Design a protein around this ligand. Structure first.
Ligand SMILES: [Mg+2]
Length: 100
RNA sequence: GAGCUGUAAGUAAGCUUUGAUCCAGAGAUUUCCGAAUGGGGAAACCCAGCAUGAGUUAUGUCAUGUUAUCGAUAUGUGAAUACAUAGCAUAUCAGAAGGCACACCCGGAGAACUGAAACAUCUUAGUACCCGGAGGAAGAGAAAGAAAAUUCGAUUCCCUUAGUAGCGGCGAGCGAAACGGGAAGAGCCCAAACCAACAAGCUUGCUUGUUGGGGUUGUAGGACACUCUACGGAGUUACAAAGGACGACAUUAGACGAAUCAUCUGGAAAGAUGAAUCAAAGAAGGUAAUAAUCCUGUAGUCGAAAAUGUUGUCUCUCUUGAGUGGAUCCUGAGUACGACGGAGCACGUGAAAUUCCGUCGGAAUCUGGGAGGACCAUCUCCUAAGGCUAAAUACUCUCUAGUGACCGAUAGUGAACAGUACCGUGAGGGAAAGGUGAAAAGCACCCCGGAAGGGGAGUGAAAUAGAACCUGAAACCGUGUGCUUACAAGUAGUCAGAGCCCGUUAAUGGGUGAUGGCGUGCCUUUUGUAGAAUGAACCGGCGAGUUACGAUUUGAUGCAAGGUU
RNA sequence: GAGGGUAGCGGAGAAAUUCCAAUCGAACCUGGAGAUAGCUGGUUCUCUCCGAAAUAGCUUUAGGGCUAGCCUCAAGUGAUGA
RNA sequence: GACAAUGGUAGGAGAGCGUUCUAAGGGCGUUGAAGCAUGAUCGUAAGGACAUGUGGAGCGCUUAGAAGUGAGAAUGCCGGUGUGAGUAGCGAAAGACGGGUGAGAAUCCCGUCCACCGAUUGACUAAGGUUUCCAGAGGAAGGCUCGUCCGCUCUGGGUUAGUCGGGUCCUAAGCUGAGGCCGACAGGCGUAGGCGAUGGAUAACAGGUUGAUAUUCCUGUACCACCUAUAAUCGUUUUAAUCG
RNA sequence: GACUCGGUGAAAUCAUAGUACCUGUGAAGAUGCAGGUUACCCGCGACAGGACGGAAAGACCCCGUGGAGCUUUACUGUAGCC
C-alpha cells in the first residue's frame, strides 16, 4: 500500500524496471500515476491551437512495489504500533521513512 | 487516516492532518395530503371561531397555540311533571378509528364448470371468492376419557396400523381409530359449605349486601370433630406481583495476518523453461493471457465510547404442613335430557350410539348422576353444566451468513437497461431494449463538400475494434467474370455424352453442358390424392409422453427358511 | 344546453329481442381455470429383425369402448402342425 | 467353411450416432481456444477428422453418471427480409408574372393583377385541449411532393383586476347526514343541519400603449364597502333621536 | 380519373416454377399424365374464359349422450300466497 510521495518500482507492463515516483492516487479505482510511466499522446483541439500532447496515464496499483530503504529491493509492507500509532515496515528491514 | 463536493463526466468556486469525505450508535429538524379529526372539498386546496403576540392613528395582514365523533372520569343543571328522569353544559384523560406479505391460524357466510361416460341423491368441496378477529404462532389441553390387560393416566405433532374396519343411486367415489414406536413434557385457579368483620332494612332475631379468610375432589374430596406440627421453600412463561445491584455472553463499525526471482514468446505473463519459498492459510475475486508467494483476502488471533438482546449471582417479594372420623352440611338449573326441524362427526337419520344450532317442553342430589354404538339387567371406567396454561407443530413480504451435476439476454422475474412507452371513460391490460478498448489514448492537422458523409495523416497489438462500436450465420440486394442460351412445350432432376475452361485432402480429378433416354413436389387424411381435398411467402430462433407416490412384470445384485427396517 | 337519477338473477322501452361506451336471446374486467372437448390439427436423430386389421359378441351403441380373432417378445412342453 | 434368409403402413423387439452438465484420469491453447467460411477427405447410417482464411480466450479425449437431449409442416409465437411494383394512391377548389433571399425555389418573403366566401370560409363568448403563444437560430426525423418554411428541433421570453367570471352571499334537483330506524357480516334508509348553478343578489367607463397582456398596465374622470380623525343634530336611555 | 414525364411510394396474395391447345386418361370437369397439333427472345395499353381465382376452419344439411333463449296439463324443486 503506497502513498502519494513514495519512490516505487514497476513490476509489470511495458515499463517494468523503471522507478519514478507517485504523483496521483485515485483510490476508488486503485490506480496510481507515476512520473515517466505509461505515457500517452492526445489529440487536443484548439480551445490556442492544440496538437499532440504527452502526459502519463494511471497504472493499476498492484503493478507497483515499494523499495527497501536499506538494501534497495522491492518488498511488501507490514504494520506496527509505536506510541499507540501505526507505522510501515519493509518486511526485510525496519521503519520506512514516508513523510513526503 | 488522505483525499473530498450523489449516479456524473466538466468548469468554476471551495473544504481538509487544528483530521475532511466515509462507516456504526444515539439525538435534533421533519413543508403539504392522507384514518385526517376546526368547517367544506373535484387528495396534495379553499374558508373560519377563540386565546395570546408583532405591527398599524386604527382597520386590513401576519405568527404561535387550541377547536371532530363516539368512549371514560368529575361537576353543575334540568322538559312534558311536584320530586325525579331523558336530556343539556363545563373540565380533565387520551380508549377506539386506518394499514398490512394481513402467507400461516381461528371464526361468519358459501358457488359453478367438473366426475358419475346423460342426471336429480352423491362428487368437485366446506374448495374459490367475500366479511370479521388476532399472534409470532394460533387452535387444543388436565378425563362425566381410552379400554376389556395383570390395564393406561392432559393436549398437540411424526411413523405404522391401512387403502384395513366401515360409509355409498352398496354406483362414481369417500375413508378412520385404539394398541405399538418416537419428538416434547407441567400443571393450576375459582363458585359453594364455613368463619370473621362492616352496612341497610329490620327488630336487633332474621334477611340481604360488601371485604377478607377457607376451599377445591371419585376406591369420593372439602367443611366440621379431634390429634401432630413451622420459615424453609416459591416466584414474575400459567400457578400473585416491582424493581434494584454486580457480572457473562451475543449482535450492531473494525485491526493484525506467512511466503518469488530470472529468461523466452508477446502489446502486455500469472503461460513455457530453470532454480526457490510458505502452509492451522492450495476458499474466492482482481491484476494488460491461466498467480498459494503482486493486490483485496483466506486459516488464525485481537477489538466497543454507545444502544439493544439474552443469561447468571445477590437483592427483592410471597407462603406452615400432616393424620383419623365419612356421609351431619357443601359440591356449577331453565342446566342435563326429551320431541320436531337441521348440521357436524370417515359415516347419505340408519341398529345410529356420540357432539352442536332454532322452537317448544323439562330432572335427580352420593342409596346421586354419566359412558361402554337401539333397549334392559349385571359388571368396568369416570364425576358434566366455571376459567387459565410453556414445549414438541405451520408460514416467509423480510434481515444476516451461505449453498446448487439451477438460467445465461426469445432464457432467468413482466422487469440485468418497468408496473414505465403505450392501450382503455373505468375496473384493468401491458412491452421492446446488455457487450469499443488493457487504458479514452474517442481520430491534432490537410483535402472535396452548405452540411451529412468520405480520402489521407495520426492513436492503438488490432479502426473491415470509430460509438448504429466483441464474434457477425441465413433469407434478401448488388458489381465483375469462366462455360452456356433468341425453332423452343418444361415437378427443372437423373442416367448416357461431345466440345470449351481449370488443376485437387492426387484419385480409375474439378467447373460448364450441344444432344438422347426416363421422370405428375412434400405433409396430413383416406377404399383410393399429381390432385381442382388440408397446410406452409422465405430464412432464423423458440415450440409436444415429464415428475412424485402406489401397483404389476422383466433384468441385475445381496442374503436365504428366512429377508428387511 | 348545463347539473343530476335508475346497473346485468338488473335497468330503460309510443314494443323493434330495442338500447345500456363502434359489441347485447342477456355488457365489460379479474378470479375458480391448465373448466370440459368420445372432435380437428400437431408430435423433432439413424440402421437391423419380424409384421397386422378394417371381423364376432354386448353397449343411450353405431366415425367411441370392452372381451375374443389376427401381430410381436420371452420361457416351456414335445409330434400334438401342413 | 457349406447352406439359407434379408419389400413393407398401425405396431412389437434390438443395436447405435450426436447435444448440455458432473466425477475421475489424461491432454491441448496468444507459436492462437470456441464460433463462423471454403475444400476434390473418412465411416454401412445417424456422423467424425484434416488443411487454409476470419476470430481473440477458452476447449476436446477415455470410462461412468444425469437430462429443459435432436423440428419442415400445428390458418403455431417472435424477429428480419421479399413478391405484387416503380404499380394503386398523394383527402372536395384558380391562379399568373415581376423582384428578393439562398448551395439549392412551381412550393419561402414582398408587389401588382386575377379569382372564391360573405345568415359567412367574417367578428365575439362557452366547453375541451394544455404552452401549441412571441423573438432569434435550424433543417436529421415529422409535413402524403419540395422547402431557405412551420402548430417540428434549439435557446431565451410572455398571462398584472376592490368594480370582468368564481370564492369570503342565497337556495333547486340531487348527494350527504349528529342523535335515530332496520339489517348474517359487509351495510341500507332517514330527522335537524350541511353541500350543490344551469337560476336570484351584487360597485368602471373613455382614450393611449407592446414582438407577445389589457374594462387588469398608463392618463383622465368615477363608484362601492370598511377604519380612524374633524365636527352642528344626539340628552334617565323606559323613553327619546338611536338601534332592535 | 385513366395514359406520357419529374417527385414520393403501399396492399390483399405467395410449395418451387423455363407455367400452350385438342382428343383421351385419371379421386369419374388437367399448364404439369399419353398421343398428336401448334409455337423465335423481351415489353406496353386493354378485356375478363380458366387457374374448381382472393376473402371468411359453410350460416343450408347431418352428427356430438356439445351449449344457450323460449313454452307447457315433461321430471324435480322453489320465491311467495292460503
Ligand atoms: Mg441481387
Amino acid at each position: 500500500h503506497i502513498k502519494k510521495g513514495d519512490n516505487v518500482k514497476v513490476i509489470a507492463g511495458k515499463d517494468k524496471g523503471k522507478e519514478g515516483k507517485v504523483i496521483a492516487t485515485l483510490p476508488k479505482k486503485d490506480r496510481v500515476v507515476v512520473e515517466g510511466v505509461n505515457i500517452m499522446k492526445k489529440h487536443q483541439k484548439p480551445t490556442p491551437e492544440g496538437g499532440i500532447l504527452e502526459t502519463e496515464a494511471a497504472i493499476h496499483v498492484s503493478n507497483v512495489q515499494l523499495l527497501d530503504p536499506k538494501t534497495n529491493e522491492p518488498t511488501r509492507v507490514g504494520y506496527k504500533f509505536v506510541d499507540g500509532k501505526k507505522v510501515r515496515i519493509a518486511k526485510k528491514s525496519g521503519e520506512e521513512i514516508k513523510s513526503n
